[PDB]
Amino acid sequence: GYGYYRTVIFSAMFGGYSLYYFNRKTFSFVMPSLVEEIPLDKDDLGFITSSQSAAYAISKFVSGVLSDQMSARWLFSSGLLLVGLVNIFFAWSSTVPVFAALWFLNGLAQGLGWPPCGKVLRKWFEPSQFGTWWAILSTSMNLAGGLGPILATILAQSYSWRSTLALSGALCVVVSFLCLLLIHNEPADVGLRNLESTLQELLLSPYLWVLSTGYLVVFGVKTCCTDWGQFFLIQEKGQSALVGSSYMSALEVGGLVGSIAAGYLSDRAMAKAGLSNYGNPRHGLLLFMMAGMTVSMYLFRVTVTSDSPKLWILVLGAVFGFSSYGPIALFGVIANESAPPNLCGTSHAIVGLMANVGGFLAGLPFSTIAKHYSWSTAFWVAEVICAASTAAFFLLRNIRTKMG
């Protein structure tokens, strides 16, 4: 009788996470029609966004460490209420400091979304199907971000800005009780069945640092290419400004399909596996996609000129997105799967912590080296770094897998 329970649990988690991500960018969704009532500038916008980003960055790690002990049913609902209440309070106030102080709590509550879902997925679904549903659930954020602007446009036309956030908060509070009532933390509670590791042992496993370095390199390269690619294409390749938007759209469209396909293929690879404590069945795609990333970077840098047509650029962007948005999901799955059953949350939190520094590296230093020599001089550096990391991961493949 696993079918009904799995269906209802996944539906509840999908709706809950869609609402969590929708109630995170609602400020940006309603921003246009908010300056006429309260006169602001770009500095206030930066202040609020920075406060939210810092709060989210801290809360992700804190929640990831905490969720290993507290229930994964009383977090996924408490965070959603808090988000809804903060949204309502934002709706019923109009001044910069209350906005800045409320959005900090918004981010702090937003940080409590994923770890409970990951824990429930690990302790409910099969070990050979844990990557497909992970990838499918990850697309709720994409769906919310792609459909939200349209709903905001058709809603704020017939109402005001304070008339939208109140409804969003009411919806969040209403659905919080449903997600609390429907989610079962473990299959043993109902009456079904499913199938000694200190934290120091987790911190004393080389595989964790290998995964951390891989995630750092992949995320840094992706951030660099998705940030300064338009500037490279508009100031060195002599292309029209129109091709940048198409290039980014192709990159995102390819990335979504890449994530889903990587999840499904890695899950399929596990069925035909001679389970052991050495190696990893998901390592084939964790290397093939990185090689594809390097090849696509080389082709984008070398064989692109004003003579090149639009189709070539679109294909290159799609291939780069397909090869770039997959290894991130695979790193997440591997870090949340190769850990002791009572320490899944901590390992994922430590791996994800290694991404803020990657973003910082992909930020100002890249602009500095571009300012000193050129854009191509920095893209070549990124290329060689990625190639060296791919090689190093290639030789270091049979390292011990099970942490602890």
Ligand SMILES: CCCCCCCCCCC(CCCCCCCCCC)(CO[C@H]1O[C@@H](CO)[C@H](O[C@@H]2O[C@@H](CO)[C@H](O)[C@@H](O)[C@@H]2O)[C@@H](O)[C@@H]1O)CO[C@H]1O[C@@H](CO)[C@H](O[C@@H]2O[C@@H](CO)[C@H](O)[C@@H](O)[C@@H]2O)[C@@H](O)[C@H]1O
């Ligand atoms: C108890 C703390 C203990 C640590 C102290 C060391 C320093 C701590 C600060 C580091 C940290 C929290 C640390 C988390 C917990 C650490 C626990 C580790 C324990 C190890 C055992 C906050 O770091 C900064 O975040 C910046 C906000 O961005 C702010 O700088 C201001 O903004 C600057 C430009 O951003 C300007 O220069 C200027 O406007 C300010 O300067 C700062 O106020 C804040 O300090 C990490 O924040 C990072 O989150 C990521 C989110 O992805 C952010 O990436 C981006 O964010 C958005 C734009 O940023 C984008 O929209 C988003 O697309 C992109 O992803 C990063 O940018 C950064 O935000």
Ligand SMILES: CCCCCCCCCCC(CCCCCCCCCC)(CO[C@H]1O[C@@H](CO)[C@H](O[C@@H]2O[C@@H](CO)[C@H](O)[C@@H](O)[C@@H]2O)[C@@H](O)[C@@H]1O)CO[C@H]1O[C@@H](CO)[C@H](O[C@@H]2O[C@@H](CO)[C@H](O)[C@@H](O)[C@@H]2O)[C@@H](O)[C@H]1O
């Ligand atoms: C099993 C899946 C179930 C179905 C759900 C998932 C599939 C739906 C995907 C929807 C999708 C694909 C667009 C092509 C559609 C064909 C796709 C084929 C499948 C569908 C048949 C829409 O992507 C665009 O959709 C547009 C609206 O249509 C938005 O325009 C807006 O509207 C204007 C006025 O309305 C306004 O001026 C203005 O607000 C916008 O300009 C764009 O903002 C949005 O990027 C992807 O959305 C998702 O992609 C990711 C990429 O990482 C993006 O997240 C990013 O993360 C950071 C870095 O990772 C980025 O730095 C950050 O910027 C971004 O947060 C977002 O894009 C996210 O939302």
